[PDB]
Design a protein around this ligand. Sequence first.
Ligand SMILES: [Mg+2]
Ligand SMILES: [Mg+2]
Ligand code: NA
Ligand code: NA
Lengths: 1011, 210
Amino acid sequence: RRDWENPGVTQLNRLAAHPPFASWRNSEEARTDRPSQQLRSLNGEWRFAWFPAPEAVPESWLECDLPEADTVVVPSNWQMHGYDAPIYTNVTYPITVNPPFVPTENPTGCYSLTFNVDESWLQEGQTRIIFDGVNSAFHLWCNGRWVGYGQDSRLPSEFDLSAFLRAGENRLAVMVLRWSDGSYLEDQDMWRMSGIFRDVSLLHKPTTQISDFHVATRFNDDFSRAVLEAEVQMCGELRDYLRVTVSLWQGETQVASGTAPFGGEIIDERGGYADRVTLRLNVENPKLWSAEIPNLYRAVVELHTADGTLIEAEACDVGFREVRIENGLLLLNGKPLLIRGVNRHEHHPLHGQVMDEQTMVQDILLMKQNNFNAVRCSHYPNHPLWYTLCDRYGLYVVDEANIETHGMVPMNRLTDDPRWLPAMSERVTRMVQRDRNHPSVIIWSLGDESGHGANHDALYRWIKSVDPSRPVQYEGGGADTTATDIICPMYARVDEDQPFPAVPKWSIKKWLSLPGETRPLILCEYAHAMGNSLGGFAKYWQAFRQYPRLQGGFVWDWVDQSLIKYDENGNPWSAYGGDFGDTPNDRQFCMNGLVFADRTPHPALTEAKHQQQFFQFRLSGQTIEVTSEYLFRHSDNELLHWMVALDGKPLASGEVPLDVAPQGKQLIELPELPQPESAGQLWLTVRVVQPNATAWSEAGHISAWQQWRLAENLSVTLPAASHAIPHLTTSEMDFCIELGNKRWQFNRQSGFLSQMWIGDKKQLLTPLRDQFTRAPLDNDIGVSEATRIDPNAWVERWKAAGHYQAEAALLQCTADTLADAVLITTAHAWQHQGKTLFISRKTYRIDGSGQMAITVDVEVASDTPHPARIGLNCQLAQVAERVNWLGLGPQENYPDRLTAACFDRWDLPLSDMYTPYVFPSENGLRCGTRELNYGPHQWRGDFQFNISRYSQQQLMETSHRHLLHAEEGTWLNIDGFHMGIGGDDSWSPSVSAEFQLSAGRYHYQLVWCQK
Amino acid sequence: GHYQAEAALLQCTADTLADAVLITTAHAWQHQGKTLFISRKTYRIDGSGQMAITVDVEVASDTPHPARIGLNCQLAQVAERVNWLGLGPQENYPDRLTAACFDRWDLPLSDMYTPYVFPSENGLRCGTRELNYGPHQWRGDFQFNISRYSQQQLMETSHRHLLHAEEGTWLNIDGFHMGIGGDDSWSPSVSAEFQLSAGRYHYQLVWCQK
Ligand SMILES: [Mg+2]
Ligand SMILES: [Mg+2]
Ligand code: NA
Ligand code: NA
């Protein structure tokens, strides 16, 4: 029988699914959540051998260990040990679309273990084995004997070993098939691995046992009174003396208790459930669970005799909370949610898809440190500890079924097929059975990117019927099917419609009010953070805040799915698709995080943290109004710091504690403003600070900030008239200027400033030429490659117009002498195939002070694609330690990604001005800059800029950061104007009309001087 | 102080170029000790007889955003026709220019003034590259209006019938203009993308006798 090729067989002899057990035998250990003797982890050094196909596996592996087998760590993906390649594929299957068959070359992992078991486990009780995650299907042997079969890579498989166990040495044998009929429901946009990648364990239950328990909490109108209902189910021999007690703890205090005999109410004509009982505990004035305040109670479920003997106990965390959709709103505890969320894949750059507590906690802190409150299990149920961490630190969780059929044509070919409903239903139902007791799970998701079929309809209704306490969502088939309670599109832009046939992605604002529509909107994915991205993020959050039925979204996504590779000198580097010999591959598309794989943030993270603040600020005269957006908590851990500065120079500051109620306003009056002496701009800043450490943040955490322009004093005083005069020395080839030890050389053929001098030290390498192009970002490229060109792409537009290779064709180069200065006047035109793309007109001016005032005016042919940048570049000779700039930062910012940045004097090392995206591009831009010191140099004006050892050439030519090499001296780009980075999605132009450079005529002036 | 602000000369110089003459001026507008505007211009007069005017304005961030950034003068001439290659034929402004079309437009002088019963700024036309009036021609990228009434007369007059045509012709050429609003007419209604908030502004004009 080929079960890995049959969707009518998803398991054999697999025991039923259930909430997480521990079979505690001591109620205090249960209550306190301490370890239980009755649950052994079998994680450790296992034996493993790899095979090309299940048919190549010898029959001697079932009885004895293969000598050629290696001793490896479990849990793990055998790819991370390098037995075969990991495959990154986005949409297209890693196998031939041939339901139900998989390839006859099917990578097969033969795991096994020799173990020892307690005498009392052999004496009595049920001993089961629990593989938390096996990817993708497997057969199980114990002591040579066949036990059962399992599918679905992201939920636990459990089998009874009691009848298989022997005295002394026992032997497991787990045959892991990488591909199965199960692979057809597991087509997520991620790395394709396999193995026993989650916990393996042994649970020892009494024969008369708790087999299930359900914890429900309903409320009255003000949540001042709550009932806790606990349905308890058992297996084994019922006896008149058995009892169940459900107790509820808050700290070290019982709050209420329920004790009763098995025997449920009459259900139907035939009676009730004799093997069940339902306990009701009344709880007055309960502490409610929210992400804002993760108030947890503890529930202990004791199976015991009326005479007072405990048989076993199971337990969970309880958060009193109600989630309903009323009058078009997602309410939590009767308050409307604002989902500040992100999609999170289970990923590690060393371990693949194996998860650990240290990583999770790192992820959970960071997210909450960067103003996130919700997360989507994109796109499968997670390692079980995740929900517990979420319950305790406080995050709203979308628990998502392990069904994805992105590769089907059309996407619903399987989800509309009733032959596939059983395989689908297992994947949905078994998530609930497992996860229904976690307070942190607020929404059930029916899977991802699988179109819309009757199967989705069928399972939605199953969930509604089985768990009325939670809304069900699903993006498939239009994001507003009969199969979702929430309009939950992916990448639906804010203002712009995208009227795709059958599945249009409307503008979110317009979507809400489509005729007859009432449901709320929360994007299941938005703001593709791929490479230099998240441009246009502030536009979402403004709309989220204005429209009450817009209730947020989950960013795509948390972490970069890069995997560590090592080089010839044994040095690590981050690798993406096709870097493993895997093909077809979707290259750098596995990498869309706000953080790098090692959990270093991309600079897009600070934008998100800023936009997702919980306090809103207004300024009206000298009056700051602070608004809390919190639904539940007061600001019991906040003080507002305020700061006024005249162009980076502190003028005054202070502290006022925030005592803001949830959704209230504090009016903080600033003292009589100290009116400044000199000339510049006053900028107000406010940072909100948490003085006390929490479980999620250090003492001093800055949770919110905002700046404002106050009074500006325009500079009027004339230059202190110097008594030096710059001398023009005109030759045949170069207009040359002197002034003391300063020397300027303008070339007559090129028409550009070719070299500067300080004494005998030349200042340049590459001349100060114009630039109208950038090394393309992932958003610029999109889906386009050399073999299939996407003609629509921003980059392919610039390539096909000539933007990238067009050459300066000097129209004029003159040099008149001024009274107190020297004045050079250039003109250039850039051409390609007889078309004039850009005319550039400049006027350099050098006075007796050393200051060189460059004035630039550019013309842009209205019918060429709008250019990426309008500015200048030169390769400076000196290599420096510091960069110093008055303007936005300190971090990298772009026209549509600069809200998070702050105007001030910033001093960073040169390498912080370079952003090491795994796919190299335009990076380290800092906008709205007025002054820029590096070495002895200084550029004043109103511009944006980037300064690195990498040319735009090297960046656009190299595909991996690790293969870049510092160049001689330092490349400087100085931009009058830069186009948006975009990123509403990464497969179509997404730079908004107001951040495209479209004016036609552009002006900007620079001042260059040695300090 | 926008209506009573007095230009105070900071700089006025001239330079003898190889094939042109260059006027360089700088100004600062003040009121109660606070600089409202600054305007650094170059006036370039070369052998073609063409005068190249370039204006680089600075608006103080904390001052309310001005209604226009541009130039005005009273012309000695009074002519019969106005001819222009810009948006037209009728009155149009930055936030009310969609009905207008870009083409060659020739109208009598009186059709360049809109007889609004309460008199105000009027008759402007936007995105003009070329404008002719008698001997004169201006080029660049600007908005303009033209009439026998000064801006001064218009605001000081309560009804149109009380307007007297002044001597010569009044020209207001702007590089930038604030939109007009009208969502209501009892509170600021000019959208943000039509307010002049940039802080630094640039427009340039060529004046010559055709
Ligand atoms: Mg099967
Ligand atoms: Mg997909
Ligand atoms: Na809202
Ligand atoms: Na991806």
